[PDB]
Design an enzyme around this catalytic site. Structure first.
Site, short mmCIF file in Angstrom:
data_model
loop_
_atom_site.label_atom_id
_atom_site.label_comp_id
_atom_site.label_asym_id
_atom_site.label_seq_id
_atom_site.Cartn_x
_atom_site.Cartn_y
_atom_site.Cartn_z
N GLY A 143 0.78 -1.24 0.00
CA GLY A 143 0.00 0.00 0.00
C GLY A 143 0.81 1.29 0.00
O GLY A 143 1.99 1.29 0.34
N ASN A 206 1.55 -13.06 2.32
CA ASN A 206 0.13 -13.33 2.14
C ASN A 206 -0.13 -14.65 1.41
O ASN A 206 -1.08 -15.35 1.76
CB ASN A 206 -0.58 -12.16 1.42
CG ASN A 206 -1.18 -11.14 2.39
OD1 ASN A 206 -1.43 -11.44 3.56
ND2 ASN A 206 -1.45 -9.94 1.91
N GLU A 254 14.99 -11.02 24.75
CA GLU A 254 16.03 -12.01 24.97
C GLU A 254 16.19 -12.91 23.76
O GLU A 254 17.32 -13.28 23.40
CB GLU A 254 15.71 -12.85 26.21
CG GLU A 254 16.91 -13.61 26.73
CD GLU A 254 16.66 -14.28 28.07
OE1 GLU A 254 16.17 -13.61 29.01
OE2 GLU A 254 16.99 -15.48 28.18
N1 LIG Z 1 -3.03 -9.97 5.35
C1 LIG Z 1 -3.69 -8.86 4.96
N2 LIG Z 1 -3.22 -8.15 3.90
C2 LIG Z 1 -3.87 -7.03 3.50
C3 LIG Z 1 -5.09 -6.59 4.21
N3 LIG Z 1 -5.52 -5.48 3.61
C4 LIG Z 1 -4.65 -5.21 2.60
N4 LIG Z 1 -3.69 -6.15 2.52
C5 LIG Z 1 -2.56 -6.17 1.57
O1 LIG Z 1 -1.94 -4.88 1.63
C6 LIG Z 1 -1.54 -4.45 0.33
C7 LIG Z 1 -2.32 -3.20 -0.05
O2 LIG Z 1 -2.07 -2.20 0.94
P1 LIG Z 1 -3.18 -1.59 1.93
O3 LIG Z 1 -2.64 -1.75 3.33
O4 LIG Z 1 -4.58 -2.07 1.62
O5 LIG Z 1 -3.17 -0.05 1.46
P2 LIG Z 1 -3.03 1.22 2.43
O6 LIG Z 1 -1.88 0.99 3.37
O7 LIG Z 1 -4.41 1.58 2.95
O8 LIG Z 1 -2.51 2.33 1.40
P3 LIG Z 1 -3.45 3.25 0.49
O9 LIG Z 1 -4.86 2.68 0.56
O10 LIG Z 1 -2.75 3.18 -0.85
O11 LIG Z 1 -3.33 4.58 1.19
C8 LIG Z 1 -1.82 -5.62 -0.59
O12 LIG Z 1 -0.63 -6.41 -0.67
C9 LIG Z 1 -2.92 -6.38 0.11
O13 LIG Z 1 -2.87 -7.76 -0.24
C10 LIG Z 1 -5.53 -7.42 5.35
O14 LIG Z 1 -6.54 -7.12 6.01
N5 LIG Z 1 -4.80 -8.50 5.65
#
Ligand SMILES: Nc1nc2c(ncn2[C@@H]2O[C@H](COP(=O)(O)OP(=O)(O)OP(=O)(O)O)[C@@H](O)[C@H]2O)c(=O)[nH]1
Ligand SMILES: Nc1nc2c(ncn2[C@@H]2O[C@H](COP(=O)(O)OP(=O)(O)OP(=O)(O)O)[C@@H](O)[C@H]2O)c(=O)[nH]1
Ligand SMILES: CCOc1ccc(-c2cn(C)nc2-c2cc(OC)c(OC)c(OC)c2)cc1
Ligand SMILES: [Ca+2]
Ligand SMILES: [Mg+2]
Ligand SMILES: [Mg+2]
Lengths: 440, 67, 421
Positions: A143, A206, A254
């Site tokens: 993200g 993931n 630790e």
């Molecule tokens: N395991 C897991 N992965 C997630 C989840 N939500 C998003 N992802 C992963 O996170 C990545 C996308 O980033 P996000 O965290 O959704 O985006 P953000 O940090 O909100 O950033 P912006 O929306 O661009 O501001 C992708 O690789 C998704 O597969 C979640 O609830 N669980």
């Protein structure tokens, strides 16, 4: 004291925080309104669970935690949902416009508008603490907020809190779950700009969490709720040492002494067992020997790599539940002969063990079976560099054509920052290679 | 040994401080270099749109001044 | 980010725009007065994107109806959902454009543009968080072609960091036989390459051919073409309009679909014009493209696919992987994971299972090449230039538009020929 402040950044972080904090409340017998019947010291206390929860005079146990996201949709569900009463409103922070899968927007453009507010809100939690130990940072590599805003925050925390420890729970991207085309760019960019500022970082692939949910819980197309509920058990195993009393409980710092031989080599491979459906666990009790042996089956790793075609620098076993030293020792002896465990010539080949008695709980109406014992192995293997390799290749394929680089340059970044980051990653791959080589 | 005990803890402070200093400065360099770059991009975009207006004034005069 | 501001310019833009507003109002549970008669909470959850909330729970489109010819104001207002539009948002000129781009962009349309901008500024200012703009227009006409690409340019000056979508209707002899549409398209394309973030190439030759061949209609009306254009416009906005577990905004789409800032001309598709493997093979089939190009004559830089209806998401994952595996040559190797797929629960009215396709393919050069041939046929003998040079333009500007469109073709070829090693 020895307080621990959790920061959850972007959707992934936020959503994993919901899972994690729901789980912690079920482990400590905390209700959704924040009341703890078993807590007799009203208003304060020096208990082990107080490392993650402060107390109000009214008796509300409030997470020592901050939730940040640059858009409101994901945090708004916390604000209206089951645990809305658990958090003070100022722990939940939003903007209006997100970083749009752009490290540049998360780190600079949209990010600079909210960074001061966040550090001001982290600071208000820090002043409740009598002996702050450090921060846990939950984010995605992929993200825009998860990559960009995290890096910005990590840099700023290094300024405000000096060398005070900062651990990461990073979500490494994979095409099965949602992905974007530019996640390799964001991954390399944040991994580069955070590497100086993080003391230890638990990557979670993931794909690995996807394959486990499909194979072991028999879930056809796992959702984020499925993945996060598994993840939060692994997060709970690592933080269990900080949250519970225990005679045979080794503290997480630790283990870190053993897990981090050089500062850059701070990426442990998490492996957890058992992950089993209620259907299969019926009339099926899994012994210490069975769950310990499962830790070396690479289908149970949080990150896809092959430790068997690499080398160990550290092996730690974090048992929780009905476990005693005797059985663990028998189990490790079994494994030493039957399995492919080569250490580097400079490390001692022992396995470091911890045991919590508080047995592992499950979220009601979850997919995981309740088991009497469990274990999380944290190893420092050179094999984890494979995760950097897969990601660095994807980066290279696009960067060769400059694909999508204009979205980053538009928001103020230079091409120099890409190559600088990528060369840091090239060095990191070479560092993981150099540590494995035998001495002279 | 007493002067060496102080030499170690002074060095421990020195490098802790140095890490905060060079982090604080390296971050300032990036946020200033970025803001310069981002405005440089948006200034050139607007300068190409302001050049379109001056061309549309030459087209509106070539209609008037060809009658 | 949430609110989009809609703009329909010229006749084509206003009609395809009108259809779009009927269809999405139907899907969100909105009637011509503007009252929520639905049932699901999903219908309302992201209603703000395209609608304002007036008093008495009134839902009013964020659309700005524009043309240099009146009468189009009447036909839109007399039409099924004509009542629902906001009365001051109508901004109509006097004498029309008469298929002259130079009138629309430079002279006549340049007068009307300021009072159009006022409606934009009034709507934009009232957005909680404005994400971007979408224009419905044609590149063949005069107003939508010329005054549309001026509004694009002018909105870019006051909102340079917002997204600029277009549903640009590309001209064809088979549907409309005006002789100077090749001039108007090529002049528009010169503005679109510089001033938009993503343009949906809706092509009339593709629309005629689908109506004739697939839909069996011997000689089709503009109503038959727009049944398609509405279903396509319904499909690509589905993720913006409804929830799902994807968030979906214009920036994240644009970011992921546009590898290079010039190369933002998508080839839409729809199916059916039923089972999942059939759907999937149908949407990647060249017969289902709303632009006149074969995907097998280039490579897919990026693709976005939207499935609608109840269906096994496990089966959709397996199937989209299948077509990438089996057709690996028709996607670029140097952009990993370059086909993304969302699923919406709620299907469109009429169908139980639809599938909508958005592809940035290098095969789009085939469309620009067709327009370049019909353009260069006329231009190299100076035919019909007096219409334009009368209104004040230089010949230089036709050469620069001819050159910039050929550059766009050449660049789509560069990346088609690009390799990994
Ligand atoms: N395991 C897991 N992965 C997630 C989840 N939500 C998003 N992802 C992963 O996170 C990545 C996308 O980033 P996000 O965290 O959704 O985006 P953000 O940090 O909100 O950033 P912006 O929306 O661009 O501001 C992708 O690789 C998704 O597969 C979640 O609830 N669980
Ligand atoms: N697909 C489709 N194309 C249309 C429709 N109406 C007009 N066109 C096309 O639009 C092109 C001409 O542009 P118009 O939109 O009619 O003209 P305009 O932009 O209003 O300009 P003026 O008439 O000069 O004011 C022709 O190539 C037509 O085939 C429609 O309802 N559907
Ligand atoms: C080949 C890369 O394509 C992509 C990747 C991601 C997205 C996207 C990300 N988010 C958060 N939302 C979208 C998205 C996806 C859509 O279709 C699959 C949309 O419908 C057209 C959409 O609406 C604008 C957003 C997009 C493309
Ligand atoms: Ca207490
Ligand atoms: Mg987000
Ligand atoms: Mg007209």
């Amino acid at each position: 004291m020895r307080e621990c402040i959790s920061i959850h950044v972007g959707q992934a972080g936020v959503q994993i925080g919901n899972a994690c904090w729901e789980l912690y409340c079920l482990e400590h017998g905390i209700q959704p309104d924040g009341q703890m019947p078993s807590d007799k010291t009203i208003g304060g206390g020096d208990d082990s669970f107080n490392t993650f929860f402060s107390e109000t005079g009214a008796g509300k146990h409030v997470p020592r935690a901050v939730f940040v996201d640059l858009e409101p949709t994901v945090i708004d569900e916390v604000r209206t949902g089951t645990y809305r009463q658990l958090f003070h409103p100022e722990q939940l922070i939003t903007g209006k416009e997100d970083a749009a899968n752009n490290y540049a927007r998360g780190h600079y453009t949209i990010g600079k508008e909210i960074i001061d507010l966040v550090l001001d809100r982290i600071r208000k939690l820090a002043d409740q603490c009598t002996g702050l130990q450090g921060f846990l940072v939950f984010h995605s590599f992929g993200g825009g907020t998860g990559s960009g805003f995290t890096s910005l925050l990590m840099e700023r925390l290094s300024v405000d809190y000096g060398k005070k420890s900062k651990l990461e729970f990073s979500i490494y991207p994979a095409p099965q779950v949602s992905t974007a085309v530019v996640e390799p760019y964001n991954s390399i960019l944040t991994t580069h700009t955070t590497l100086e500022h993080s003391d230890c970082a638990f990557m979670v692939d993931n794909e690995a969490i996807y394959d486990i949910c499909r194979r072991n819980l028999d879930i056809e197309r796992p959702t984020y709720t499925n993945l996060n509920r598994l993840i939060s058990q692994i997060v709970s195993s690592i933080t269990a040492s900080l949250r519970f009393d225990g005679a045979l409980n080794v503290d997480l710092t630790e283990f870190q002494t053993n897990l981090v031989p050089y500062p850059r080599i701070h990426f442990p491979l998490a492996t957890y067992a058992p992950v089993i459906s209620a259907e299969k666990a019926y009339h099926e009790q899994l012994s210490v020997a069975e769950i310990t042996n499962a830790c070396f089956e690479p289908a149970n790793q949080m990150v896809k790599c092959d430790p068997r075609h690499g080398k160990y620098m550290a092996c730690c076993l974090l048992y929780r539940g009905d476990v005693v030293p005797k059985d663990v020792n028998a189990a490790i002896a079994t494994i030493k002969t039957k399995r492919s465990i080569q250490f580097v010539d400079w490390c001692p080949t022992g396995f470091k063990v911890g045991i919590n008695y508080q047995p592992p709980t499950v979220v009601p109406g979850g997919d995981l079976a309740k088991v009497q014992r469990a274990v999380c192995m944290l190893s420092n293997t050179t094999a984890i560099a494979e995760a950097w390799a897969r990601l660095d290749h994807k980066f290279d394929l696009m960067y060769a054509k400059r694909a999508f680089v204009h979205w980053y340059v538009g928001e103020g970044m230079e091409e120099g920052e890409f190559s600088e980051a990528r060369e840091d990653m090239a060095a990191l791959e070479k560092d993981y290679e150099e540590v494995g080589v035998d001495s002279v | 040994k007493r002067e060496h005990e102080r030499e170690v803890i002074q060095k421990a402070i020195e490098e802790n401080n140095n890490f905060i200093k060079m982090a604080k400065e390296k971050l300032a360099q990036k946020m200033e270099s970025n803001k310069e770059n981002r405005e440089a991009h948006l200034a050139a975009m607007l300068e190409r749109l302001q050049e379109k207006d001056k061309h549309a004034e030459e087209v509106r005069k070539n209609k008037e001044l060809k009658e | 980010m949430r609110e989009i501001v809609h703009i329909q310019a010229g006749q084509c833009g206003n009609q395809i725009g009108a259809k779009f507003w009927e269809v999405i109002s139907d899907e969100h549970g909105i009637d011509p007065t503007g009252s929520y008669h639905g049932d699901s909470d999903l219908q309302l959850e992201r209603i703000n994107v395209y609608y304002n909330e007036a008093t008495g729970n009134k839902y009013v489109p964020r659309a700005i109806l524009v043309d240099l010819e009146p009468g189009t104001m009447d036909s839109v207002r007399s039409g099924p959902f004509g009542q629902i539009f906001r009365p001051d948002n109508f901004v109509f000129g006097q004498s029309g454009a008469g298929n002259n781009w130079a009138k629309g962009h430079y002279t006549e349309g340049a007068e009307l543009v300021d009072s159009v901008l006022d409606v934009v500024r009034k709507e934009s200012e009232s957005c909680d968080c404005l994400q971007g703009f979408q224009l419905t227009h044609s590149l063949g006409g005069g107003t939508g072609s010329g005054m549309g690409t001026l509004l694009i340019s002018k909105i870019r000056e006051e909102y340079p960091d917002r997204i600029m979508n277009t549903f640009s209707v590309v001209p064809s002899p088979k549907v409309s036989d005006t002789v100077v549409e090749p001039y108007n398209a090529t002049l528009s394309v010169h503005q679109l390459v510089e001033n938009t973030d993503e343009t949906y190439c809706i092509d009339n030759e593709a629309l005629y051919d689908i109506c004739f061949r697939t839909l069996k209609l011997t000689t089709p009306t503009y109503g038959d073409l727009n049944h398609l254009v509405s279903a396509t416009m319904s499909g690509v906005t589905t993720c913006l309009r409804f929830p799902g577990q994807l968030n979906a905004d214009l920036r994240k789409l644009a970011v992921n679909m546009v590898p290079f800032p010039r190369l933002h001309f998508f080839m839409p598709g729809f199916a059916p014009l039923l089972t999942v493997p059939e759907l999937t093979q149908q949407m990647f089939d060249a017969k289902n493209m709303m632009a006149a190009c074969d995907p097998r004559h280039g490579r897919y830089l990026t693709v976005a696919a939207v499935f609608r209806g109840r269906m096994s998401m496990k089966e959709v994952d397996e199937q989209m992987l299948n077509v990438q595996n089996k057709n690996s040559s028709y996607f670029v190797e140097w952009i990993p994971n370059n086909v993304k797929t969302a699923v919406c629960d709620i299907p469109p009215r009429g169908l139980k299972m639809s599938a909508t396709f958005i592809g940035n393919s290098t095969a789009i050069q085939e469309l620009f090449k067709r327009i370049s041939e019909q353009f260069t046929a006329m231009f190299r003998r100076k035919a019909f230039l007096h219409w334009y040079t009368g209104e004040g333009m230089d010949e230089m500007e036709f050469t620069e538009a001819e050159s910039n469109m050929n550059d766009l073709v050449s660049e789509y070829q560069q990346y088609q020929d690009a390799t990994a090693d």
